[PDB]
């Protein structure tokens, strides 16, 4: 654990992390719909659709164990309301014991199978019923068909979107913030769904924890304080850990990673966490996250309109995802596997000591690199981290990184792109995407572009001079640093930040965790 | 129709070369087992080395003592196989005749990609352009499958030909030596057809916008159809008004050239088992309209290429009309017009009505391609086809997703998308499946019209354009090929004719 | 106190000229009803002709010399006209058979000259003083001016006549000679005599401020500026205190300190105080933005039209406040206590700089999400406003080169005033009138406040949707005054005189008149 | 600031009076633009909706 340097004594020296969230105090009970719904305190919400009838009428199908509430919810009363996706209504009535109860529904549309994006819309509607209403309990009645993973996704998303991060509030805390203490879920074949509840809560915190690191500003989350957070996390989970400092990085000849951090007041810190199963180890995996805690662009300063330099605390979203995965893996303790969680953390700054456009630098596999643009720094840090990962002797290397802005022009803000040198590995990532419900799309590494990286003087160019398809070119670059290991690369530059909600998504935690678990 | 002119010097047709020197080349395919005769012209050995950039070593037998001595291992070791490197020497053979002998390096990979093979071909063509020859002979000392072999022939033919129509010598024989020569001979004349559909596409694209305008391009298509005995129909403004194609007619309002909608049809002999509509975007010049292409890098001087999709569809008509596949019916459609700045032009913010009744709020007059394609798709679905495939230089964002080498395909039907991907493998024109992400559909929800033409927020323009196109296909398998990044060869300063061979392979493979 | 240096040639103080040539001018005022003596130097008549646009010149004064009276009779003067700013020179012999120079400056046809029209008159007069080695100037007022305008005439003449040669070395003007005598003839002279030395005080306060502004950033840095402020306090016998970093850390000025993090010069907070002898009825804090160079920080001023080479003037507000301190310390008003405040720092690019997106904590506990490092002035003012309110004053007025949007709203002639108190604003407008430094009241539009709602901090530094930056910046500053009448004077558009390529010293007389009128 | 909702007016319905009681409304707050409304049966068993802004 290292000392965080300060310019002034008001500079913070750690990231505030909330571990014991109000979500963790929520008692969750799952009941089978066949037993009928008890409708008592709190708010009871039916999730209802009308297959085929766009904006069709609401009909409540479940048995309700209360004559008054059953009468209130009969078809002719409900027919003036419709199932339009995201609609909701509140109901007030007295039950059979003369206690007032609150009931309502959320519309789930007319399509039988909700997509992840449809389900998020339903959850957002449900959460607006939880905000600005001091409730002790929520009950949710599923009158829609969801498989096990989509049930888990529903809960993860509910937990994530209900939580409000006030770590940086001081004079402006929400006076009225109270969370429910109890969550009831009514669903058919409840016994098959119960196993998803604790998994959902683990997936929620891994995602929320990565979100807390991303949203933390760069004066709080810097290379020293971020690697201290990873040490603390590993201590709580009994993970092995090792933080490499500059000396050790110099000895390992990590010249591409070290050159990116030369201009920072914070020394480079390379994070290496390990989880090993107690049994026989049948699979070794390295997960690599880009960890740039602030990206000014360097001397290729982000000054062009739309370059969004104020967002760039988010350039360690990949590291955050990998650490959030370490929380889920360390908590759920999968068997027969050894996972290495890696991040070459640094800060990309303008200074007399910064590396320069045109500098030629030597990565740890001895390849010389001509720097054509100091703002393409992530691929330099990953080059050395990929060489480190391969020396571990793993079966798979997966990296995740907010690498290229061109992703916003290719897949946009909803799907990450995955690239790789190995079709089997790529299919497993896509399978994890489908079970985690974090969407990813396979994109090609087009070999015809490789020659635009030929350098007149160094072994290779960092950037292309001619090719504008920069996500593919960056993948071509990274591929040069994996000699003989199956490797995939997930570019989350376009999906990491939720611009509408002004917050991170913690994207990738569930994806990488499903990837580890199903292996 | 008569092409309107501003002055009498204004051109009134697209010059086209149908009969090209390529068509005079006599092609002969020989087996390698017999050894190679080196009696005239230039003879090139395609050789690899599976040591990286290691030395050239010739394995074929040559029936000539002098050339054999030239090719002995001690000489050729002075040369290397780095991809595209070549040397050729002139010398006298056993009968005191002058012959040229050389090689092209094919690298160290056993399987050549389409990109590598293109690099091999370019080095060959460079020698062809610098030497007065009567004959070229190519000796395949590498392994290529039938499709890759035909691709080599098409690419050689296409790159060898020089388009001199706007300016103010070729070999007469091609010899090929290859293992299992008999299995390759049927590819030869198919390559010749594929070359010409591609070169004809490229002639239309390279033709500037004063020669190639909606009128003269629909006239060119008529002449093409007459030569191939295809049914043909050109819709004018009167008929387009009757069909209420307001999106398409709006784009052309500011042009001096009337809109012309092209419709050709190929009908197979025998039972028709599949009906396909191929839809090409045909903007003969895209200035941007009032959303003028004035921004750095918007490259207005390239926008004669905005009809590359139409040209690909007409080049496919040539190939289909010439090879005459069976059991298929194909419609070749294009809504041709020109996007100009005028007192009569459509404006940013106009609300127009498409031919299916959907109102569209225009957010940017430079997103004109999707407006013309919308009315073209409503026309096509009314034909009752099984498949609609449209091909278009639609969004500049392709340059930032897949780049200049691979085109993007989006669609509403996985089986149709998979047929396109399979056609990409056998045509060796590279395509990559990109998604239509439904979560972005809400960005097209106009406050006043039924739908917005563009998003004001989402930067994934190629996906948003596909979501817009998809709104104009109700109940038909549909796919959309965005060739905006891939159509123009910036290094060679010429069109690629991209998509002809892809679409023809799609038709022929059913 | 010690200015850090990179190399030994770096300057360690701001060159400041206190005893200017203006101060060596003997000024005499005579009543015009006694007649004008024309003996020597240049004698300029200020002449209008009401109604008749471009009307003929007529010299109404009595001239106590037969030869010059004859030269100036109406027949001779008829070929000249009074178009505002026009001027002519005459040469003749007086009764003593000495040659004299005489002339006039046209003041137009409107009998009431505006602030801007009188500037035009002075500039024409000054053209007659330049490139002419004269020992004496006489001005005859044949136009009507109240007392504040006669003062404004003199202040302006003094300011424009002076030439700042502190940074000239091999290109000093070898012909630079200043008059040693100024004579003024005006109706009811006795009532205008008191304005002369006031104008001289107001001239130097303005000129002192312009010296600090024009001084480049390698001379005028946070340490050398606070050093000069101390030296001014000592000369004026003002109380003074300079707060360094350790004391600012103790005061928890996290907003102010973050801006200066990237600089080689330690932050210095200037605190000067004037206190009347006897009863103190009004307590006032004047707060001046003092960024000695504004690079933009990591939001570097690199966009076309951002004029990074002008950004030595970003301490203009601090300079106005120090100039006002000179005037108040010199004129010594009664019944008031005045605090002269400036949070001085430099906004630089470095490994140590604050970053876009940092969340920082102001001295009032509020957390701030930095959205643009180039909106640094409102951060330093935030902590300075908190400091000022803890002093327990009746009024807080701040003056700052805050927003470039002022060029698009009021432009280069009028400053904008914003505030939370109607009475204070009217006092500023009233002082604007008697100082002749023009100011226009602009609203603080509360509907925009929501765009400063931050997702993670208590407040955003900037709006991401509102383009009305002068108003948004005012809404931000309001969050740092809890219960005190406060006004904010944005001088970003009016501070630099782009045509003459020099500072105006704007605000010194406005603030001094504000203090003086509240004392009376 | 952002204090609880409290309804002063008397309403001539027993069902809605109970819904509007202080103990129920204080779970809601008056932050500008925040609203809730609920469907219920009134004394005549007619469907009505009651809320606040
Ligand atoms: O894609 C690039 N750079 C990314 C970067 O700076 N990596 O360390 C980059 C990554 C994300 C963004 C970005 C992402 C967003 F989601 C966004 F909203 C935005 F405004 C910018 C922009 C650039 C390259 C392009 C080639 C030259 C170097 C910069
Ligand atoms: O993608 C767009 N426009 C394309 C167009 O004009 N369609 O009619 C467009 C298509 C191709 C290019 C383009 C392609 C190139 F290969 C190229 F080199 C180039 F400079 C531009 C640019 C824009 C939209 C993007 C949404 C808003 C309007 C402009
Ligand atoms: O108004 C702003 N910035 C001013 C500033 O940097 N304050 O410390 C700013 C102030 C003055 C100018 C300015 C003033 C001039 F008189 C001028 F000629 C000029 F070119 C710029 C430009 C910007 C904001 C604009 C939105 C948030 C980022 C900075
Ligand atoms: Zn970068
Ligand atoms: Zn266009
Ligand atoms: Zn600034």
């Amino acid at each position: 654990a290292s000392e965080v340097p300060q310019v002034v004594s008001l500079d913070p020296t750690s990231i505030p992390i909330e571990y014991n969230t109000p979500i963790h105090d929520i008692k969750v009970q799952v009941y089978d719909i066949k037993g009928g719904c008890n409708v008592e305190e709190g708010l009871t919400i039916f999730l209802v659709n009308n297959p085929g009838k766009e904006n069709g009428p609401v009909k409540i199908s479940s048995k309700v164990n209360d004559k008054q509430v059953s009468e209130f919810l009969k078809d002719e009363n409900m027919e003036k309301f419709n199932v339009k996706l995201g609609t909701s209504k509140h109901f007030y009535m007295f039950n059979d014991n003369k206690n007032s109860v609150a009931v309502g529904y959320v519309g789930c549309g007319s399509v039988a199978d909700l997509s992840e994006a449809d389900m998020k819309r339903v959850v957002l509607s449900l959460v607006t019923m939880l905000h600005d209403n001091k409730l002790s309990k929520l009950t949710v009645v599923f009158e829609i068909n969801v498989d096990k993973n989509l049930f888990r996704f529903f809960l993860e998303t509910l937990f994530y979107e209900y939580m409000t991060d006030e770590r940086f509030k001081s004079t402006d805390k929400n006076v009225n913030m109270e969370y429910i203490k109890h969550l009831g879920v009514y669903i058919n074949n409840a016994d098959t769904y119960k196993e998803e509840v604790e998994k959902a809560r683990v997936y929620y915190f891994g995602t929320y924890y990565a979100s807390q690191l991303i949203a933390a500003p760069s004066n709080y989350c810097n290379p020293v304080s971020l690697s201290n957070a990873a040490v603390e996390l590993a201590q709580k989970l009994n993970l092995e850990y090792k933080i490499l400092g500059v000396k050790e990085l110099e000895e390992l000849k990590m010249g591409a990673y070290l050159s990116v951090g030369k201009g920072s007041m914070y020394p480079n810190k390379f994070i290496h966490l390990t989880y090993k199963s107690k049994g026989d180890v049948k699979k070794k995996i390295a997960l690599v996250g880009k960890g740039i805690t602030f990206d000014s662009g360097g001397y290729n300063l982000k000054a062009a309109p739309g370059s969004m330099i104020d967002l760039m605390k988010f350039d360690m979203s990949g590291c955050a995802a990998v650490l959030g995965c370490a929380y889920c893996v360390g908590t759920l303790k999968p068997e027969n596997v050894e996972i290495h969680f890696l991040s070459a953390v640094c800060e990309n700054m303008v200074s007399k000591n910064s590396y320069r456009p045109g500098d030629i630098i030597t990565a740890s596999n001895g390849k010389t690199i001509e720097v054509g643009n100091t703002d393409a720094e992530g691929r330099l840090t990953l080059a050395d981290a990929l060489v480190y990962a391969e020396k571990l002797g793993v079966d798979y290397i997966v990296d995740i990184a907010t690498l290229t802005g061109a992703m916003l022009y290719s897949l946009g803000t909803s799907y990450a792109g995955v690239f790789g040198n190995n079709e089997e590995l790529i299919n497993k990532i896509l399978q994890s995407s489908k079970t985690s419900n974090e969407p990813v799309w396979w994109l090609p590494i087009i070999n015809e572009y490789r020659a635009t990286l030929n350098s007149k003087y160094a072994d290779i160019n960092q950037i292309s001079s001619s090719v504008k398809a920069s996500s593919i070119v960056a993948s071509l670059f990274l591929k040069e640093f994996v000699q003989n290991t199956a490797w995939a690369h997930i570019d989350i530059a376009g999906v990491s930040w939720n611009f509408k909600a002004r917050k991170p998504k913690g994207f990738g935690v569930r994806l990488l965790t499903e990837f580890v678990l199903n292996d």
Side-chain angles (χ1 to χ4, degrees), chain A residues 1-33 35-52 55-58 60-62 64-66 68-79 81-97 99-120 122-174 176-180 182-194 196-246 248-275 277 279 281 283-423 425-433 435-519:
Chain A
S2 314
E3 294 305 311
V4 172
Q6 304 174 288
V7 190
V8 293
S9 63
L10 309 180
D11 281 337
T13 61
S14 64
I15 304 163
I17 294 298
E18 189 177 348
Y19 293 97
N20 302 292
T21 72
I23 300 309
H24 287 102
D25 300 344
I26 301 189
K27 292 187 188 157
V28 185
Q29 300 265 325
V30 185
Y31 317 101
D32 200 292
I33 280 197
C37 309
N38 296 340
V39 173
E40 297 164 7
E41 76 270 8
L43 179 62
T44 305
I45 299 303
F46 296 82
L47 308 179
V48 312
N49 64 9
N50 198 323
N55 291 3
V58 162
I60 305 292
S61 64
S62 300
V64 159
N65 299 328
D66 190 277
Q68 295 293 124
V69 173
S70 294
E71 165 69 18
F72 188 109
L73 301 172
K74 70 184 182 178
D75 282 11
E76 52 256 50
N77 284 332
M78 290 295 101
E79 70 178 18
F81 309 117
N82 70 79
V83 299
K84 177 192 201 184
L85 181 58
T87 313
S88 58
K89 295 288 177 165
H90 284 85
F91 305 143
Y92 172 91
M93 70 213 72
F94 296 79
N95 65 7
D96 282 334
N97 288 269
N99 303 124
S100 55
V101 293
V103 184
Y105 78 94
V106 179
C108 303
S110 323
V111 179
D113 286 334
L114 300 153
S115 89
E116 41 95 31
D118 300 323
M119 181 62 82
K120 177 143 179 302
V122 166
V123 170
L124 287 180
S125 287
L126 181 49
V127 155
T128 75
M129 319 184 89
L130 290 168
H131 288 167
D132 303 292
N133 194 340
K134 298 181 175 169
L135 300 159
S136 65
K137 176 179 294 190
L138 176 75
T139 297
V140 172
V141 182
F142 278 79
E143 300 200 1
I144 53 164
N145 289 315
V146 296
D147 64 14
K148 279 160 71 186
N149 291 325
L150 182 49
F151 177 81
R152 198 193 53 248
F153 180 78
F154 167 86
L155 288 178
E156 298 158 356
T157 312
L158 177 57
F159 294 159
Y160 187 80
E161 299 295 338
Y162 188 32
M163 194 56 208
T164 303
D165 178 5
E166 295 203 313
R167 291 169 298 148
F168 299 95
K169 301 285 176 175
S170 165
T171 76
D172 189 51
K173 292 179 180 298
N174 185 334
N176 300 306
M177 191 104 73
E178 312 184 359
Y179 296 81
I180 62 169
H182 305 284
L183 174 68
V185 186
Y186 285 84
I187 199 164
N188 278 120
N189 311 314
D191 268 4
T192 78
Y193 291 98
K194 293 194 184 188
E196 306 302 320
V197 173
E198 266 322 305
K199 188 185 181 179
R201 179 130 59 192
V202 177
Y203 278 23
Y204 145 74
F205 185 68
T207 311
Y208 188 68
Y209 170 85
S211 147
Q212 283 183 72
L213 299 166
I214 301 159
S218 293
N219 62 325
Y220 282 87
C221 166
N222 57 67
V224 180
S225 73
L226 188 52
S227 58
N228 288 348
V231 167
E232 173 170 287
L233 179 74
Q235 292 170 340
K236 290 178 185 306
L237 299 168
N238 268 275
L239 295 173
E240 300 178 349
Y241 71 87
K242 174 161 99 127
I243 303 299
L244 277 37
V246 308
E248 259 200 271
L249 296 163
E250 290 167 343
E251 188 75 23
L252 288 157
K253 302 180 170 308
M254 293 207 203
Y257 169 41
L258 280 167
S259 297
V260 174
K262 286 172 47 161
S264 173
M265 70 177 288
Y266 305 107
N268 281 26
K269 305 288 184 171
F270 191 105
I271 296 172
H272 183 174
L273 311 188
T274 304
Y275 171 84
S277 295
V281 163
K283 217 49 152 295
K284 299 183 167 71
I285 305 178
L287 307 182
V288 185
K290 171 182 179 179
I292 306 278
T293 55
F294 181 73
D295 185 11
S296 66
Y299 271 98
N300 287 91
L301 179 73
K302 282 168 195 292
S307 49
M308 279 207 69
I309 189 174
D310 74 314
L311 169 74
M312 288 305 149
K313 71 184 173 172
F314 87 132
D315 223 14
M316 37 61 68
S317 292
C319 180
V322 155
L323 292 181
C325 182
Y327 164 82
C328 299
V329 174
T331 294
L332 285 175
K333 309 194 225 160
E335 300 176 30
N336 313 313
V337 77
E338 175 180 306
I339 315 293
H340 302 280
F341 309 88
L342 309 180
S343 193
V345 183
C346 62
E347 202 197 30
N348 193 24
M349 302 294 275
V350 172
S351 153
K352 73 177 73 196
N353 302 129
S354 302
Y355 80 133
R356 273 158 301 252
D359 281 358
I360 285 176
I361 60 189
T362 308
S364 52
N365 65 350
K367 284 224 216 320
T368 55
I369 299 155
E370 183 162 19
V371 177
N373 184 314
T374 64
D375 200 13
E377 84 291 334
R379 78 188 66 178
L380 296 177
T381 66
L382 293 163
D384 275 325
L386 286 176
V387 171
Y388 182 95
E390 182 155 56
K391 292 191 203 304
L392 297 173
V394 291
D395 307 317
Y396 307 126
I397 303 166
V398 184
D399 75 66
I400 186 163
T402 52
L403 208 52
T404 57
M407 288 305 304
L408 288 164
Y409 298 102
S410 71
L411 295 175
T413 55
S414 292
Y415 281 52
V418 58
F419 309 71
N421 72 6
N422 183 270
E423 193 166 296
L425 185 49
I426 287 158
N427 279 342
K428 292 176 168 205
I429 299 309
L430 299 172
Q431 181 65 17
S432 305
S433 172
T435 69
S436 65
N437 266 312
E438 297 208 272
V440 195
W441 197 266
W442 183 17
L443 293 169
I445 297 175
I446 297 171
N447 286 332
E448 174 161 20
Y449 303 159
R450 175 54 182 76
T452 75
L453 295 182
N454 295 335
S455 172
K456 177 75 177 180
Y457 294 99
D459 297 331
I460 191 187
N461 280 336
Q462 172 211 32
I463 63 166
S464 172
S465 211
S466 53
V467 177
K468 304 197 176 165
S470 34
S471 313
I472 294 171
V473 176
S475 307
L476 273 167
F477 182 85
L478 291 178
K479 178 140 89 81
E480 294 287 295
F481 296 88
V482 192
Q483 294 319 318
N484 215 255
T485 306
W487 155 81
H489 161 59
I490 318 191
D491 199 336
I492 54 165
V495 309
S496 177
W497 192 264
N498 181 343
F499 291 88
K500 181 90 147 63
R502 311 181 291 154
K503 62 180 186 188
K505 303 187 196 165
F507 182 103
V509 166
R510 291 170 287 176
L511 169 61
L512 300 183
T513 297
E514 287 291 291
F515 169 67
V516 177
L517 286 178
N518 309 336
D519 218 51

